[PDB]
Amino acid sequence: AIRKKLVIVGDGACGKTCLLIVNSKDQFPEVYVPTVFENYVADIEVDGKQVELALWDTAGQEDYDRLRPLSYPDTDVILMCFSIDSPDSLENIPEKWTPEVKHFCPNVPIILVGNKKDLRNDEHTRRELAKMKQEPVKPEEGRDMANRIGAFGYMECSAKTKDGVREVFEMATRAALQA
Ligand SMILES: Nc1nc2c(ncn2[C@@H]2O[C@H](COP(=O)(O)OP(=O)(O)O)[C@@H](O)[C@H]2O)c(=O)[nH]1
Ligand SMILES: [Mg+2]
Structure with missing residues (x-):
C-alpha cells in the first residue's frame, strides 16, 4: 500500500479536526480536542490503487505559529481550510496560510477546502453575518482564491452533514499521487 502524508491547516474553529474525525476508527462524542492526538489513517482507493494517508492535524492560532512547522516535514498533500461562515478565515488564506505552507512544503499540492x-443557507449564520454587513463565502470566491494561490483544486464540504467529505479526501489522494 502506497504511503502518503496529509497535513490540514487553517484558522482556528474553521472545522479542521471535525473534518478529519469524519473518518475514524471510533467516535468520542462529548470530548473537545484542539487537534487529533492519535495516529489517524485514511484508507482510500484511487484508480485501483491502495493508499494509506496519514492525517496530521494542526492548531491554527497565532500562539502555535512557532511550533506548528514541526508537522510539515515530508508532507505529500495539504488541505488548506477556511469556513464558509467566516469571511475572515478566507482572508487569511492568501495572507497567512499560503506563504507558510509554500515555505515549509515547497511544491506540495494544496487542496483549498x-x-x-x-x-x-443557515438562517442563524446569515443573521449573524448580516448584522455586520457580511454574508457567507460564495463558491465563486473559493474558486477565485484557488486560482490566486495556485491550489490544485477547490472543494466544499460539511463535516456536519457529510456532504463533499469523501471527495475532499479522494482529491487529496489523487494530488498526493502525482509526484
Ligand atoms: N455547522 C457546522 N459546524 C461545524 C462543521 N465542522 C465543524 N463544526 C463546528 O465548528 C467548531 C470547530 O470545529 P473544529 O473541527 O474543532 O475546528 P478546528 O479548530 O479548525 O479544528 C465545532 O463546534 C464544530 O462542532 C460543519 O461542517 N458544519
Ligand atoms: Mg482542531
Whole structure:
C-alpha cells in the first residue's frame, strides 16, 4: 500500500479536526480536542490503487505559529481550510496560510477546502453575518482564491452533514499521487 502524508491547516474553529474525525476508527462524542492526538489513517482507493494517508492535524492560532512547522516535514498533500461562515478565515488564506505552507512544503499540492457548507443557507449564520454587513463565502470566491494561490483544486464540504467529505479526501489522494 502506497504511503502518503496529509497535513490540514487553517484558522482556528474553521472545522479542521471535525473534518478529519469524519473518518475514524471510533467516535468520542462529548470530548473537545484542539487537534487529533492519535495516529489517524485514511484508507482510500484511487484508480485501483491502495493508499494509506496519514492525517496530521494542526492548531491554527497565532500562539502555535512557532511550533506548528514541526508537522510539515515530508508532507505529500495539504488541505488548506477556511469556513464558509467566516469571511475572515478566507482572508487569511492568501495572507497567512499560503506563504507558510509554500515555505515549509515547497511544491506540495494544496487542496483549498471550504468547510461548513451547511451554514451557507443557515438562517442563524446569515443573521449573524448580516448584522455586520457580511454574508457567507460564495463558491465563486473559493474558486477565485484557488486560482490566486495556485491550489490544485477547490472543494466544499460539511463535516456536519457529510456532504463533499469523501471527495475532499479522494482529491487529496489523487494530488498526493502525482509526484
Ligand atoms: N455547522 C457546522 N459546524 C461545524 C462543521 N465542522 C465543524 N463544526 C463546528 O465548528 C467548531 C470547530 O470545529 P473544529 O473541527 O474543532 O475546528 P478546528 O479548530 O479548525 O479544528 C465545532 O463546534 C464544530 O462542532 C460543519 O461542517 N458544519
Ligand atoms: Mg482542531
